[PDB]
Each structure stands twice: as C-alpha cells, then as structure tokens.
Amino acid sequence: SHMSKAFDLVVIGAGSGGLEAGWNAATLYGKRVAVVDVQTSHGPPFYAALGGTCVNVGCVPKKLMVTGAQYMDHLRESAGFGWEFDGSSVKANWKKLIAAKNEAVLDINKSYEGMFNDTEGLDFFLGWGSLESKNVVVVRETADPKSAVKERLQADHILLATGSWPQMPAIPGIEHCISSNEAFYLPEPPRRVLTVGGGFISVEFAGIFNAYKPPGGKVTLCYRNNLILRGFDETIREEVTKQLTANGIEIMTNENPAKVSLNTDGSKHVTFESGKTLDVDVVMMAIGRIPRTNDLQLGNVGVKLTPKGGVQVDEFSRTNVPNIYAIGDITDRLMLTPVAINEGAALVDTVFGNKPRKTDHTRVASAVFSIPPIGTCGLIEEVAAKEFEKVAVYMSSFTPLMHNISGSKYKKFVAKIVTNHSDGTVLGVHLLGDGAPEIIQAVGVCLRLNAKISDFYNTIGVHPTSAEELCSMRTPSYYYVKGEKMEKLP
Amino acid sequence: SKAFDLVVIGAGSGGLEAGWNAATLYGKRVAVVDVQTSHGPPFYAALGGTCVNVGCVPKKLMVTGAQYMDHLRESAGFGWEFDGSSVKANWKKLIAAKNEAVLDINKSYEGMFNDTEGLDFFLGWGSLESKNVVVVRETADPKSAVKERLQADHILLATGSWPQMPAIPGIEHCISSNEAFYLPEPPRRVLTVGGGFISVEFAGIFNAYKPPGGKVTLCYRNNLILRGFDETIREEVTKQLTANGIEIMTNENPAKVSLNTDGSKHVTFESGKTLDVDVVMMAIGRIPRTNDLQLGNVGVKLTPKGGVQVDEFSRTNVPNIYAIGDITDRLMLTPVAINEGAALVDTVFGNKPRKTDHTRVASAVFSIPPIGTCGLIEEVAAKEFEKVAVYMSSFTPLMHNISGSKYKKFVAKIVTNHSDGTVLGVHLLGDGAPEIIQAVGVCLRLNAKISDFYNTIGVHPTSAEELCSMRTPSYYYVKGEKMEKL
Ligand SMILES: Cc1cc2nc3c(=O)[nH]c(=O)nc-3n(C[C@H](O)[C@H](O)[C@H](O)COP(=O)(O)OP(=O)(O)OC[C@H]3O[C@@H](n4cnc5c(N)ncnc54)[C@H](O)[C@@H]3O)c2cc1C
Ligand SMILES: Cc1cc2nc3c(=O)[nH]c(=O)nc-3n(C[C@H](O)[C@H](O)[C@H](O)COP(=O)(O)OP(=O)(O)OC[C@H]3O[C@@H](n4cnc5c(N)ncnc54)[C@H](O)[C@@H]3O)c2cc1C
Ligand SMILES: NC(=O)C1=CN([C@@H]2O[C@H](COP(=O)(O)OP(=O)(O)OC[C@H]3O[C@@H](n4cnc5c(N)ncnc54)[C@H](OP(=O)(O)O)[C@@H]3O)[C@@H](O)[C@H]2O)C=CC1
Ligand SMILES: NC(=O)C1=CN([C@@H]2O[C@H](COP(=O)(O)OP(=O)(O)OC[C@H]3O[C@@H](n4cnc5c(N)ncnc54)[C@H](OP(=O)(O)O)[C@@H]3O)[C@@H](O)[C@H]2O)C=CC1
Ligand code: NA
Ligand code: NA
Ligand code: NA
C-alpha cells in the first residue's frame, strides 16, 4: 500500500542504542516499533549499517583486527618459551584478515535482518529518517532532504540515535586523507602510514597498522600537544607511549598536519604546522567524532542542540520537545557502545515502563585496545584531587615474570587505585597491560557498590595473575592534600 | 643455642609472610627454617616454598609456554602465514628459562634475609624438641647431626604439603609434579593420573611440548573430572581438552605399574586395561607435611584427614604453637597461606585478633582453556537455600570463529540466592577467566546482587561483559530440585 504506517515509537538509527531501545520496547512492553537505517550491511558507501558503528566499523571489527595484530607479539615472544620456527617465512596477510573481518561482520548484519523479519511489532525501514513534524518521521532515499520519500512513519514517541561521524580538519588537501571508516576497507596495508590524533582511534589503529605493515614499513602517530591520551591516567599515558615506541611506532608529539599534497608517485607529502615534513602512503585522521545531527532536520520541530553540537538532553534523555528523545553518541556525553545500550534501556523503561530510570555516567568501566591495552574505571587522580581534600594513590608497576622470558622487558603492567583518603572510597582504577580490559569489568561492579581500599585488600588474590596487584595494596605510594602532590602526609 | 620471639618452620608462602610481618611490622626477632636455599632435586621445594619452586610460579610459566601451541595455529585465521612444518616445541629451553627465573627468586629471597633486621634464616630440618624449643638437624632423620637449637616464645608450623602416592605395586616407577618440573625431555607418551588441578594443568603442558607422534592420557577414577567445580564447566573443559588431543580416560585407575625393557612404563588399570607410556605422573592429591616435625614430643593434635588441627585463629591445642597454610588442610592455595600467616601474626603480636575468611575465595585452574571461580557451585547452594537461580551464558567468542578453534566456548555462570538476588557464586571458563574473576571476589565481599552486575555497564568487546548482561535465570533449584521455571 501507499499508506503511511503508525508506531508507538520510531527510532532513527539502528545502532547500539537504537537496537536496544527498539527491541526492548517491542518484546518487553508489547509496543509497535519502527527502526530506520540507511544500509542493511557494512561498508561503502555509508559504512555504518544495521547494527550501528559498533558492529560495522567500530567495536567489533576493530577488536578482531587488534586481535590479529597481537599475534605479531605472540609469534616473537613464543621463542622465549622454546618455540622454534622459521622466522624468515613470516608474513602478515592483510587481505585475509580483512576478508575474515567482513564475513564475521556480514553474519551479524544477516542475523539482524533475520530478527526484524521475525519479531512482532519491530519493523525495519531502509532509508534516511528525518523529522517532518512532532509525530511524523519521513524516510527518504538519501540525506538530501529533497530526495524521494519512501515512507512516512507516524510516531507517538520519536527516538534519535544516529550516533556520530569522523571529524576532518579543514586543511589544504584534506581530500587525500581518510578516516577510520576507509581504514577498515583498505585493499592493502600501508607501507608508511600517519595516524593523526592522540586518542582511542589513532592509538588503536597504529597498533593494527604496525603489525600488518609490509617489510621496511613504518607507522607514525602524530599528536598536537605533549602527551597522548589526555583524560587517562598520567602514568599510563607515559607508559603506553614508551610501549608503543618500543614496538616500532614513532610518536611525534607537538606536531599537527597543516597541509597534504601528492608527490609525483602518488604518495602523500605531509607538512606539519612546525614546517617539518613526512611522506606516507596513507594519512588517517582520527581527531574526534561528532554527533550526527545534520541530516535529521531538527529545525522542523525545534529540537535544541548544545553549543557543542549534540542533541541537548536531560538526565532521562529527553529533548526540549516533549516526546522526542536522544541517546548514544548523538548526545555527545560518553561515547561508548554499552553506554548507548544502557541509555536506550533506561529511556524505554521510563517512557513505557511505570518507573523512571537514568543512566549513571560516572564510574563507567572502559578500555583502549591498544597494544598493550588499557582498562579504566572512575576518576584520574588529578580530577579527584580537585574534589577531595585528601586523595591517596596506590601504584604497582613492574614487568611480569613471563615477560623476562618472552623478551618483551618493556611490558610493564601498571595498576593504580585512587581513593578518597578520608574514608577509603575507591574513586578510580587504572590498568595497563595484557588482560586490562577483562580485569576491569568486575571493578565496575565494585565502584557501583561503593568499594573501599580495604575491600580490595581483604579480598584474597588469585595467583599468579596480573589482577591480584589490585588486592595486595595497603600502603599509598603518595597523596594529594590540598590538590598538592606529596610522598607523605604532614 | 639462640633465642627468638618467633621461629617459623618452613620458608614458604605462609611462613615468609608471617615471619616478615612479625619482624618488620612488629619489630620481633624471627628465625625461619628451610631444607634447601634454591629449587630442584633432591628436596624440590626450598626458600620461597612450593609456590615459587615447584608450584604456582614455574607452572604458570610452563602453561604460558604451552599456550603458544594454540596461538601459533590460531594466528593463521587472521592472516598470519609461516612454515607450520618448521614448528618445533623445545622443552629443554622452556625448562632452562623456567629454572633461571626461579633461581633469581631464590636469590632475591636470600637478599631479602640479609637486608632485613630481626629476620634470620636457618638451613636444615626443623623439629619440635619441646613446647618452646625448635631443633634443626642435618637431614629429615631425628638422629642426624643437630645444627641449631632455637628457643621460641612462639612457633609457627608452615611446612606445607607433599604429593600423595597410592600404595600400588610399581609406585616407585611413577613420578609426581616435583619430578615433572625437571624432566630432561618432554615425554612422548604420558599418563597424568587424577582428575584435579595438577593432572589437568600438566596434561595441558605435556600436550603442547610433546615430540612428534606423542599422546597425553589423563585418567580419572570416576565419571567426570574436577569434582568440586561447576558442573557445566567440568563437562566443557573435558570437551575442550579432548578437542586439543588429550585422551580423557574416565572410570579408570592404575592397579599396578612395571618397567619395560626400553625404559618406558607398563600400566595396568583396575579394569584390566593396559597402556604403555614414557612417564606416569601421579597427581592424586597433596597431603600435609607433618611426619618430620616430631609432633609427638609436644603432642600437637592431628585431624582424621591428617593435617594439624587449628581454631579459626590458627592456634594448635598447644598454647604458643601455631600452624598455617597447606599443613592445616583448610584451603591449599598460596594467597590463602599468605593471608593465614598475616592474620596469625596480627592476632599474636598485634592488638588485632584476626581470622582468615575461607568462604568466597577466588581461584583458578591454569588449564588450556583456563578456569576462574569464586564462591558456591549450584549443587551446594541448593542444599543451603530454598530457592537458587542460575544465570548462564556459553558460546564461542567471535574471535574463535576466525581462529578456527570453534570448540573454545566461553562459559560464564552466576549462581544466586533467588530470594534476595545475592550472588553466591560465579564460574568461568575461557581465556582471561583467572583475570576476570579477581574483582568478582571483591564483589562478593560487598554483598553484590545479580542486579548490581546487570546494571553495571559492560566493557565492550570483552568476555567479561558477559557477567553484566545476564538478566533472566536460565534455570532454578527449588528445594534442591533443578527445574526450568518455578
Ligand atoms: C573505529 C571505532 C572503534 C570503536 N570501538 C569501541 C569499542 O571498542 N568499545 C566501545 O565501547 N565503543 C567503541 N566505539 C564507539 C561506539 O561505536 C559508539 O559509542 C556507539 O556505536 C554509539 O552507539 P549509537 O547507537 O549512539 O550509534 P551507532 O552505533 O553509530 O548507530 C547509529 C546508526 O544510525 C545510522 N544513521 C545515521 N543517520 C541516519 C539517518 N538520518 N537515518 C537512518 N539512520 C541513520 C547509522 O547508519 C548507524 O547505523 C568505537 C567507535 C569507532 C568509530
Ligand atoms: C604443582 C603445583 C602448582 C600449584 N599452583 C598453584 C597456583 O597456581 N596458585 C595457587 O594459589 N596455589 C598453587 N599451588 C598450591 C600452593 O603452592 C600451596 O597452597 C602453597 O604453596 C602453600 O604454602 P605453605 O606456606 O602452606 O607451604 P609451602 O609454600 O609449600 O612451603 C613449605 C616449606 O616448608 C619446607 N619444609 C617442609 N618441612 C620442613 C622441615 N621439616 N624443616 C624445614 N623446612 C621444611 C618446604 O621445603 C617448603 O618450602 C600449587 C601446588 C602445586 C604442587
Ligand atoms: N575502545 C574504545 O572504547 C573506543 C572508543 N572510541 C570512542 O570514540 C570517540 C572518538 O574517537 P577519536 O576519534 O580517537 O577521538 P578522541 O576524542 O578520543 O581523541 C581525538 C584526538 O585528536 C586530537 N584532536 C582533537 N582535535 C584535533 C584537531 N582539531 N587537530 C588535531 N588534533 C586534534 C585530540 O587532542 P586533545 O587531547 O588535544 O583534544 C585527541 O588526541 C572516543 O573519544 C571514544 O569515546 C573510539 C575507538 C575505540
Ligand atoms: N592453580 C591453582 O590454584 C592450583 C592449586 N593447587 C592446589 O594443590 C591441591 C592438590 O592438587 P592435586 O594433586 O590436583 O589434588 P586435587 O585434590 O586437586 O585432585 C586430586 C584428584 O585425584 C583423585 N584421587 C584422589 N584420591 C585418589 C586415589 N586414592 N586414587 C586415585 N585417584 C585419587 C581425586 O578424585 P576424587 O574427586 O574422586 O576424589 C581428584 O580428581 C589442589 O587441590 C589445589 O588446592 C594445585 C595446582 C594448581
Ligand atoms: Na589481599
Ligand atoms: Na637478617
Ligand atoms: Na549491563
């Protein structure tokens, strides 16, 4: 038919948050739900598809890629333990990796497809959603608001969950640059590659490129200021920098690309603000991601943006427009998949359940799948020290015995616990080293339960592990007193 | 003769924690006794204990070395190419690297003694001469050349345990974990005997380093290995060791062993079956090392099971004599022995009478794949709580759809008291499980409920996030009866 369809809830963007939102509303609460996305499976032209950034061009494939990359390390380090093979025969075949990543991704797409053909009151619509009015979502053939209309969807409640998009700086020859999106689809691993940025994506990808580089290859990461990974634990920022360098990656600090042009042979000639130069085969910009509001036509209903660009929301995910809600990266609070998932469930429960619920944005466990990986939950010391007269820091940082054998002496495992010293409350835990992301999950539960240093300490360690460092620390290495760092209390 | 506040017999995980704590927190004058200064035959354990010498430390390295068999094969799926026929597992190298690491620990333990005041070390064999006197002789025999007479206000028994050997003909042609640590070469065919920690861990080790053509056989006298651990996990870990080429013989138990002309061993099981192997390793339990203490001179009391009797404070029936760690038979874990030592010295020379909590202790089996657990298994919970709920997730992580090890199901189980949602037990199988479970131990000391886990935000992608995404029970035990619904 040529008639519009009517829903309790339309969700725009079928990603981490939107999927959880939709599924919950239908299966839990018996609501009729519509979900809109631009593409049924991963890749060009739109990259994100059904399943979101996570599944298609994010969490899932990067983690498979980082996992592939860790074999570089494993193969070398096995020698310490008696493994002998022909080192000269060793090749890292990127196309195989990328083909296997694509098959895995596509299965997830296909199963999502399955589910929406199956579940009562959960319908999928292919196209570009925008807001026509308070209770009408329009689905057009492209982002152009003048493209043809495929559907009009009537909605009592509209959820906005279109996520984010890579930020590209406006510099000469920016068109010779890629983002993470294109990185996932490179026909060949680059011989020379520059990853611009000192954050999650740059540091994770550098690790990937570094393992898969052809012979004579070089990965370079540039960062515009002095120390990468602002927002993370200072000891950890400095350590991951040592460790990345130790594994063959050049970290250029205080350097920022000013322009890019093509050499005669087609490679990329980068000029930094400092005037320094660098030739690479690929320049990947990873300088941030921004909420995807531009195509929603929010102007039509009057949904307000933050000064920043995200949809403004209250703690309950509600926009200034009564029945229109936003979640996930589109709000630009915390950009994480399981955060987006939690926001979706809390929204749905609130709107369609009998009992309001808000997502807790503090104490969120999270990771960097760098080589080696970070795992963190809670406040860094310098932030705690601005909010508490007395702050204790417990630090353990040592090369693990397995790594005096493996030959990777530079692989210090770091475990840091941050306390309000007045009362023992654990404010933050920061880890670096193998297993950090896994160790950290349960630490999330601890912080929720208002854990204290003595709670960890009284817990009997599992031995031999890295994790047990968290449960053998009773004496602070240092303190901050009025925001002042000191070895001892006066 | 020489006088001391505390004499510690046994320089192991527990002994050392207690002695140091006694010297350096309480300023006491401490003597610690041990039979050997570094690792290996003929007494195997030494300064550092079983842990350091012939337990936790060296086996975790060895297991780590074993894991590479999987990584090497598994890299292929992610695009790694190399010549798989060039791949040799060099055991002599593994052993020499292991020996070197353990030697450095023995060395830095000597160092520690020379650098700490009120902490003295005595080489030799410790016996209780009388309520307040510890003699050190040259050998384990009570009539050997007395080396030292230590006068003691307090005596800590910290001698640990020893491999149990069954009384069967040809038992002298078997080895234990001790000798396993020192084999000149990796066995081609080997029988690990027993269904517990050590059998399972070593099986994993021999399976990786076995020369071309080899086979590891693990045998267990009953139907399913690893009694005492979660049931789904005993089944799965079985399946997964099988998938990695380990033959698991259930309901089988050696009745005798003999020497074959080639140096290998002929094993006859009770059932009548036979098997030829290069090495039979008995891993059928560990018993409290009591026999050389001459406990009869003081009359320190044993239990039926064989270990020194203590109260919750680690005190013997004899006033100033205490026992901690494996000798007491409570929980044979290194960090349990370290905590036991700590608590005892806080009761005695502190103002703070302290007792170790043996419930909710996280621990691991370093099997390939590994296990991690804290708290009750469901069959035990159902005997103690009217309503028990079980939340379960079990499936192959996506990385192992690509590695091609499709059989590495990751298992996460949460066992609650369904009445109030209290988490009673968590059980894990899969890479990371021993790391994942450490903080889970902390949770249980904060009366975490199933909803605390679920309402925590996951870290994605991890195996661990599985613990924070289980909302609905898979099944229930009502009054002891397993049912799907209520
Ligand atoms: C390379 C990379 C790696 C990452 N790794 C991790 C990680 O390891 N762990 C982690 O926790 N987070 C990771 N993230 C972040 C994580 O992916 C996001 O926080 C999460 O995807 C946000 O979920 P969401 O629902 O808000 O949006 P998304 O998952 O992005 O879903 C948005 C969906 O909306 C669609 N869409 C956009 N506009 C329209 C339109 N108008 N009409 C219809 N559909 C539209 C898009 O196609 C997309 O599918 C990573 C991100 C990137 C880029
Ligand atoms: C192969 C193996 C692997 C293991 N792996 C782990 C693991 O990964 N994690 C874990 O938590 N636990 C593990 N364990 C168990 C763990 O080692 C014990 O629970 C722990 O060592 C207990 O320590 P203890 O202080 O009670 O005595 P020990 O650590 O065993 O030390 C006792 C010391 O007493 C000495 N001694 C004995 N008699 C005398 C005497 N008469 N005079 C002087 N000295 C004497 C011995 O030489 C020994 O060094 C493992 C055990 C084995 C056998
Ligand atoms: N495993 C995980 O959890 C992952 C999470 N993510 C999520 O996606 C978000 C975005 O990832 P990402 O793109 O790496 O962004 P981030 O915001 O994490 O980091 C961006 C980096 O670019 C630098 N930068 C910012 N602006 C500029 C500029 N104009 N010119 C030059 N450099 C600049 C920043 O420096 P400065 O400090 O000076 O601002 C910072 O070093 C992440 O914050 C995270 O929330 C992404 C990948 C993996
Ligand atoms: N990583 C860690 O934390 C480790 C800790 N350890 C510690 O050391 C202790 C001892 O290790 P282990 O040697 O494996 O002993 P365990 O008690 O762990 O396992 C013993 C196995 O031997 C079987 N068995 C018992 N008696 C006999 C018998 N008479 N004849 C034949 N078989 C028998 C038992 O079967 P049944 O169930 O039927 O009684 C059981 O399956 C462990 O329990 C653990 O506490 C050891 C290694 C690693
Ligand atoms: Na502890
Ligand atoms: Na000394
Ligand atoms: Na959760």
Q: Tell me whether residue A316 is annotated as binding.
A: no
Inside any domain, residue A481: no
Rounded to a whole number of angstroms, the distance from the CA of B253 to the nearest CA of chain A is 31
Q: Are B11 and B47 in contact (CB under 8 A)?
A: yes
CA atoms within 13 A on the CB side of A158: 27
Q: Please report, in range form, the residues annotated as the binding site of B for NAD(+).
A: 194-201, 285
Residues B345 and B376 placed together within one structural domain of the fold: no
Q: Which amino acid is at B29?
A: R
Distance CA A62, CA A284 (A): 15
What are the start-end ranges of the H helices in B349-455?
378-382, 399-403, 433-444, 450-455
Q: To which residue do tokens 């602070």 refer?
A: A476
Q: Tell me whether residue A395 is annotated as binding.
A: no
Q: Do B460 and A91 touch (CB under 8 A)?
A: no
- The closest alpha carbon to A168, from A153, A158, A181, A154, belongs to A181
> How many beta-carbon pairs under 8 angstroms link A with B?
260
Residues A17 and A29 placed together within one structural domain of the fold: yes
Q: Are A208 and A219 in contact (CB under 8 A)?
A: no
Q: Are A487 and A476 in contact (CB under 8 A)?
A: no
Mutate to test the pocket of ligand 2, among B159, B284, B287, B289 (most ligand atoms within 8 A of CB): B159
Residues of chain B contacting A63 with CB distance shorter than 8 Å: 399, 461
Distance CA B17, CA B93 (A): 32
Tokens, residue B79: 């695009």
Residues of chain A contacting B464 with CB distance shorter than 8 Å: 437-442
Q: Which residues contact B302 (CB under 8 A, 6 or more apart)?
A: B290, B295, B308, B309
Residues B4 and B122 placed together within one structural domain of the fold: yes
- Establish whether residue A335 lines the binding site of ligand 1, counting it when its CB lies within 6 angstroms of any ligand atom: yes
Task: Give the position, in ligand 3's atom list, of the atom nearest the Cα of A231.
Answer: 37
Residues A69 and A127 placed together within one structural domain of the fold: yes
Q: Which residues contact A411 (CB under 8 A, 6 or more apart)?
A: A243, A372, A399, A400, A403, A433, A434
Please give the resolution of this entry in Å, rounded to 1 decimal.
Answer: 2.5
- Give contacts of A 96-155 with B, CB under 8 A: 96-97, 100, 104
For chain A, the maximum distance between any two Cα atoms, rounded to a whole number of angstroms, is: 79
Total residue count of chain B as it appears in this document = 486
Q: Tell me whether residue A202 is annotated as binding.
A: yes
Residues A316 and A374 placed together within one structural domain of the fold: no
Number of domains chain A contains: 3
Task: Give the position, in ligand 4's atom list, of the atom nearest the Cα of B197.
Answer: 14
Residues A175 and A127 placed together within one structural domain of the fold: no
Final residue belonging to a domain, choices A327, A342, A362: A362
Rounded to a whole number of angstroms, the distance from the CA of A457 to the nearest CA of chain B is 9
Residues B232 and B83 placed together within one structural domain of the fold: no
Ligand 7: distance of its center to the CA of B432 in Å?
A: 19
Sign of CA dihedral A266, A272, A186, A291: negative
Question: For residue A258, what is the enclosing H or E element?
Answer: strand A257-262
Distance CA B103, CA B291 (A): 28
Task: Give the position, in ligand 3's atom list, of the atom nearest the Cα of A335.
Answer: 45
Helices H / strands E in chain A, number of each? 12, 25
Residues of chain B contacting A339 with CB distance shorter than 8 Å: 457
**Which residues precede gaps in chain A, with C-N > 2.5 A?**
none
Distance CA B465, CA B462 (A): 5
Residues B25 and B146 placed together within one structural domain of the fold: yes
Q: Is the Cβ of A306 closer than 8 Å to some Cβ of chain B?
A: no
B418 is a catalytic site residue: no
Q: Is the Cβ of B395 closer than 8 Å to some Cβ of chain A?
A: no
For residue B109, give its domain range.
Answer: 1-163+285-359
Distance CA B277, CA B189 (A): 5
Per-residue exposure over A205-229, b if at least 16 CB sit within 10 Å of its own CB, e if not: bbbbbbbbbeeebbbbbbbbeeebb
Residues A134 and A266 placed together within one structural domain of the fold: no
Rounded to a whole number of angstroms, the distance from the CA of A336 to the nearest CA of chain B is 8
Per-residue exposure over B72-106, b if at least 16 CB sit within 10 Å of its own CB, e if not: bebbbbbbbebeeeebebbbebbbebbbebbeebb
Q: Do B61 and A405 touch (CB under 8 A)?
A: yes
Burial class (CB in 10 A: 0-12, 13-18, 19+), B152: buried
Q: Do B442 and A455 touch (CB under 8 A)?
A: yes
Q: Do B78 and A63 touch (CB under 8 A)?
A: no
A94, A367, A458: residue with CB nearest B459: A367
Inside any domain, residue B34: yes
Q: Do A71 and B75 touch (CB under 8 A)?
A: yes
In DSSP terms, A417 is beta-bridged to A394, A429
Inside any domain, residue B483: no
Residues A100 and A34 placed together within one structural domain of the fold: yes
Ligand 6: distance of its center to the CA of B46 in Å?
A: 18
Q: Which residues contact A381 (CB under 8 A, 6 or more apart)?
A: A233, A234, A391, A393, A416, A418, A428, A480
Final residue belonging to a domain, choices A287, A313, A333: A287
Q: Are A454 and B333 in contact (CB under 8 A)?
A: no
Rounded to the nearest 5°, which phi and psi values hold at A103?
-65, -45
Residues of chain B contacting A440 with CB distance shorter than 8 Å: 439, 459, 464
What are the start-end ranges of the H helices in A119-224?
180-183, 200-212
Inside any domain, residue A317: yes
CATH number at residue A463: 3.30.390.30
DSSP one-letter code for A475: S
Inside any domain, residue B477: no
Q: Do A92 and B80 touch (CB under 8 A)?
A: yes
- N-terminal to C-terminal alpha carbon distance within chain B: 70
Inside any domain, residue B486: no
In DSSP terms, A5 is beta-bridged to A153
Q: Do B452 and A448 touch (CB under 8 A)?
A: yes
Q: Is the Cβ of A254 closer than 8 Å to some Cβ of chain B?
A: no
Residues B156 and B203 placed together within one structural domain of the fold: no
Q: Are A221 and A237 in contact (CB under 8 A)?
A: no
Distance CA A166, CA B179 (A): 59
Residues of chain A contacting B457 with CB distance shorter than 8 Å: 336, 338-339, 342, 360, 364-365, 444
Rounded to the nearest 5°, which phi and psi values hold at B213?
100, -15
Residues A107 and A239 placed together within one structural domain of the fold: no
Final residue belonging to a domain, choices B231, B253, B284: B284
CATH number at residue B241: 3.50.50.60
Experimental method: X-ray
CA atoms within 13 A on the CB side of B446: 27
- Establish whether residue B126 lines the binding site of ligand 2, counting it when its CB lies within 6 angstroms of any ligand atom: yes
